[PDB]
Amino acid sequence: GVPMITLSSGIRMPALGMGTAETMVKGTEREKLAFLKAIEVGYRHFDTAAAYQSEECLGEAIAEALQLGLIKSRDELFITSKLWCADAHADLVLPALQNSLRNLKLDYLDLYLIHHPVSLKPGIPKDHILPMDYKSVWAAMEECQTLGFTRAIGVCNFSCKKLQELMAAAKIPPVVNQVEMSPTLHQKNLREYCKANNIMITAHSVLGAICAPWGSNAVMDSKVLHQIAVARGKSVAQVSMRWVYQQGASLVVKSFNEGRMKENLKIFDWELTAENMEKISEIPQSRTSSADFLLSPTGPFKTEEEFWDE
């Protein structure tokens, strides 16, 4: 099945997880049925965020998955949620996590991440984007683990530069850095630093977010990946996701239909040859998921090069 990844703290992590559609609107009951279907197919790692108001759909799906005997216990699952920038302030982190736990109908999370390396004024508007205090927020994240409300803590979309900034006063180092990674964004430099510090790389937007406004077609319409997919008898989607795992990375994928989420679990039964990786290593680079919704002429980051340090 899905291999387990041993994180730096000893916590086991299912290498392949399923995320939630990045819609900052309410949750549909078709989302809940998709989560329940993933559990029935064989997914145990699920990745949500408080910014998408879809946690209650995952909480309902977990509850019904236990009712239907699909899983026998909650400790069979690896639930992850993220801290929204509006609550990315010291005294506001623990109320934020306890709210996500009440929405999820859970008592603890398996992993708690910081969504973006920025803060927001508690109330996209560009006047509200505020520079993050990495030391005080991470200390609150560190307390969230000590009190038992989460088993591990991490970060999302953190550059190698900003990681060292958070690693300075860190008592509990980040276990996971969830960043964009695909055959069009190799992240060699970031994966080089995280490997030497035992930070796990979890890849989002493995397919370039073809369905989102901030996405592109650089992965799904790649004629390089098409050629490999036919040689190996796979789809373009499985070639990209196999590449991420074969680089020693975790990955969260968004599955809107039972056809794809059944095929996604088959990336662990085959292997890309040595050339296949060399032909992919020379693919031109293009970052899809842009933080231009977080770029403010008044805030900490005003260009794409400052947010990503590239």
Q: Are 83 and 115 in contact (CB under 8 A)?
A: yes
Dihedral of the CA atoms 160, 151, 115, 187 (nearest 10)?
30
CA pair distance 185, 181, nearest whole angstrom? 5
Q: Is residue 186 annotated as a catalytic residue, yes or no?
A: no
Euclidean distance between the first and the last CA atom of the chain, given in angstroms as a whole number? 37
Pairing of strands 200-204, 176-180: parallel
Residue found by looking up tokens 């996701």 in the block: 241
Q: 52 an active-site residue?
A: yes
By what method was this entry solved? X-ray
Q: What share of the chain is helix, strand, coil (3-state, %, to 5)?
A: 40, 15, 45
Q: Would you say 115 is a known binding-site residue?
A: yes
Say if residue 44 carries a ligand binding annotation. Answer: no
Catalytic residue among 89, 115, 116, 204: 115
Nearest residue to 271 via CA among 244, 251, 242: 242
Residue with tokens 């703290």: 9
Q: What is the largest CA-CA distance in the chain?
A: 54
Q: State yes or no: 255 annotated in a binding site.
A: yes
Q: Identify which of 241, 238, 249, 234 has the alpha carbon closest to the alpha carbon of residue 206.
A: 241
309: which 2 tokens? 């340090």
Owning domain of residue 291: 1-310
**Resolution attained, angstroms:** 2.4
Structural domain tally of the chain?
A: 1
Q: Which helix (H) or strand (E) holds 6?
A: strand 4-6
Task: Tell whether the torsion through CA atoms of 116, 120, 122 and 125 is positive or negative.
Answer: negative
Question: What are the beta bridge partners of residue 150?
Answer: 109
Tell whether 205 is in a known binding site. yes
Between CA 218 and CA 205 the distance in angstroms is 12
Q: Helix count (H) and strand count (E) of the chain? A: 11, 12
Annotation-wise, does 238 bind a ligand? no
116 marked ligand binding residue? no
Q: Are 274 and 243 in contact (CB under 8 A)?
A: no
Q: What is the dihedral of CA 96, 256, 45, 164, to 10 degrees?
A: -60
178 is in an annotated binding site: yes
Please give the Cα distance from 154 to 175 (Å, whole number). 5
Residue 152's identity, in one-letter code, is A
Angle at CA 13, nearest 5°, toward 84 and 147?
55
**Which member of 43, 52, 112, 134 is catalytic?**
52
